[PDB]
Amino acid sequence: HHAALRQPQVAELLAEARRAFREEFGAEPELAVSAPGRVNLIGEHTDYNQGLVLPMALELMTVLVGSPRKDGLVSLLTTSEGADEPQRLQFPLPTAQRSLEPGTPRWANYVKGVIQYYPAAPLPGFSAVVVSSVPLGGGLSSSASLEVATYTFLQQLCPDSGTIAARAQVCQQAEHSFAGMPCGIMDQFISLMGQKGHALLIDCRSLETSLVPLSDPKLAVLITNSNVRHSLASSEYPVRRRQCEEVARALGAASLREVQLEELEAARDLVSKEGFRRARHVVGEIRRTAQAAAALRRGDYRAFGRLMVESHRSLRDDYEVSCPELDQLVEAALAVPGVYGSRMTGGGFGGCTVTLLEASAAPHAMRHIQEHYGGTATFYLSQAADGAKVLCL
Ligand SMILES: O=C1CCCC2=C1C1(CCCCC1)N=C(Nc1nc3ccccc3o1)N2
Ligand SMILES: OC[C@H]1O[C@@H](O)[C@H](O)[C@@H](O)[C@H]1O
Numbered sequence: 001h002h003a004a005l006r007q008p009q010v011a012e013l014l015a016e017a018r019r020a021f022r023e024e025f026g027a028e029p030e031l032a033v034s035a036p037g038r039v040n041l042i043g044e045h046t047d048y049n050q051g052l053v054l055p056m057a058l059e060l061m062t063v064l065v066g067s068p069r070k071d072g073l074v075s076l077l078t079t080s081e082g083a084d085e086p087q088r089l090q091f092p093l094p095t096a097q098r099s100l101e102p103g104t105p106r107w108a109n110y111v112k113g114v115i116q117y118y119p120a121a122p123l124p125g126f127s128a129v130v131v132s133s134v135p136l137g138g139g140l141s142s143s144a145s146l147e148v149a150t151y152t153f154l155q156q157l158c159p160d161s162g163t164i165a166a167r168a169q170v171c172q173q174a175e176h177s178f179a180g181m182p183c184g185i186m187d188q189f190i191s192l193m194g195q196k197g198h199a200l201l202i203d204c205r206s207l208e209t210s211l212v213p214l215s216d217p218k219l220a221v222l223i224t225n226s227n228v229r230h231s232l233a234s235s236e237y238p239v240r241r242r243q244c245e246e247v248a249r250a251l252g253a254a255s256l257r258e259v260q261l262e263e264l265e266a267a268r269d270l271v272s273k274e275g276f277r278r279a280r281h282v283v284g285e286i287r288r289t290a291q292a293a294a295a296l297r298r299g300d301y302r303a304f305g306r307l308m309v310e311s312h313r314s315l316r317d318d319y320e321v322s323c324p325e326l327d328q329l330v331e332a333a334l335a336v337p338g339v340y341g342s343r344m345t346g347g348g349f350g351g352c353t354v355t356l357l358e359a360s361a362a363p364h365a366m367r368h369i370q371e372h373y374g375g376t377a378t379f380y381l382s383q384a385a386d387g388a389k390v391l392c393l
Pocket of ligand 2: 043044045046047048183184185186187346347348
């Protein structure tokens with residue numbers, strides 16, 4: 001099997017969500033919102049180091065459809081097959097007396113976290129159906145898209161008077177506290193600020209962002225899901241953060257963004273062998289991401305793709321967050337004529353690779369990758385998509 005997976009269009013997700021809502025609450029929902037998943041083109045394990053990242057939002061998205069309530073109740077239904085039980089859930093709005101807490105089902109910890117830290121009041125209660133085409137925990141940020149869709153819904157109930165970064169950070173806080181995943185800010189930011197036909201260069205120190213056109217009929221972004229997820233993934237992520245902090249402290253730096261590749265080379269003995277390799281990835285990856293944005297600006301897909309491949313080797317050998325399945329998928333992809341570059345994307349230890357290629361080479365690329373992969377790969381061909389949006393029903 002080597003054809004791209006169906007990507008449900010928005011009209012399909014809306015129809016499903018409204019049918020599930022009518023059938024469950026006996027009336028037509030009044031509001032719809034959505035927020036997408038994402039793929040990171042380059043700039044991996046840099047966001048929590050205040051570095052640069054270059055993601056784009058995907059046509060895979062999460063949809064909320066719902067209505068405000070007057071009884072201070074939050075009533076949730078999700079139609080997503082792989083969400084853990086129960087898929088119906090209710091709880092009253094938190095107060096200074098009773099705050100929400102992480103519990104079961106896990107998929108609602110994302111919604112609760114966001115309601116809990118939502119910065120404006122008064123928030124009414126609401127009824128809402130959650131649908132999503134983002135493969136749950138597939139490495140394309142299903143949780144961030146649920147958080148951001150929830151945030152975008154709350155804004156319709158109680159407008160915040162805030163900024164995009166504040167919203168991303170609310171959603172990042174929910175991830176940290178209600179899901180126990182100490183992520184950076186990239187996934188929430190792109191889900192919030194994506195735009196069709198654009199990648200988003202995010203400066204995670206200044207919080208400056210740039211919408212870089214990424215729309216060329218002859219260019220494709222191929223996402224390949226390894227469909228494996230090593231247990232190591234969850235546990236090594238904080239180990240990598242902590243190794244990064246060690247090097248930053250040793251160089252007297254607020255973060256590794258403040259550390260130049262040449263300052264690192266000059267301070268080997270102040271840090272371990274492993275910590276040095278981890279910082280060398282991060283420092284070089286920040287520089288590669290800036291160079292990739294420039295390459296994209298001039299339409300230099302060959303240079304962009306070479307930087308991707310250097311990003312992969314750095315992640316495999318210096319940061320050690322790849323795995324044999326990702327490495328095989330990358331090497332397979334790079335043997336296909338028309339492919340500019342390929343690399344793991346997201347956190348690592350499983351999940352997806354991202355491949356930049358000539359659009360006409362996509363059918364060959366998918367066949368060749370599948371035939372040279374010991375597992376069962378899944379594929380997405382995605383254009384750069386919109387971030388969070390609202391449709392009044
Ligand atoms: O178990 C893990 C491990 C860490 C990554 C991750 C999860 C699970 C969360 C619990 C249910 C299945 C998997 N879900 C997400 N994201 C997500 N779940 C959603 C449910 C409905 C709508 C949109 C959703 O996005 N991420
Ligand atoms: O670049 C690695 C990325 O891994 C993601 O899973 C994480 O949520 C992001 O914040 C980023 O750190």
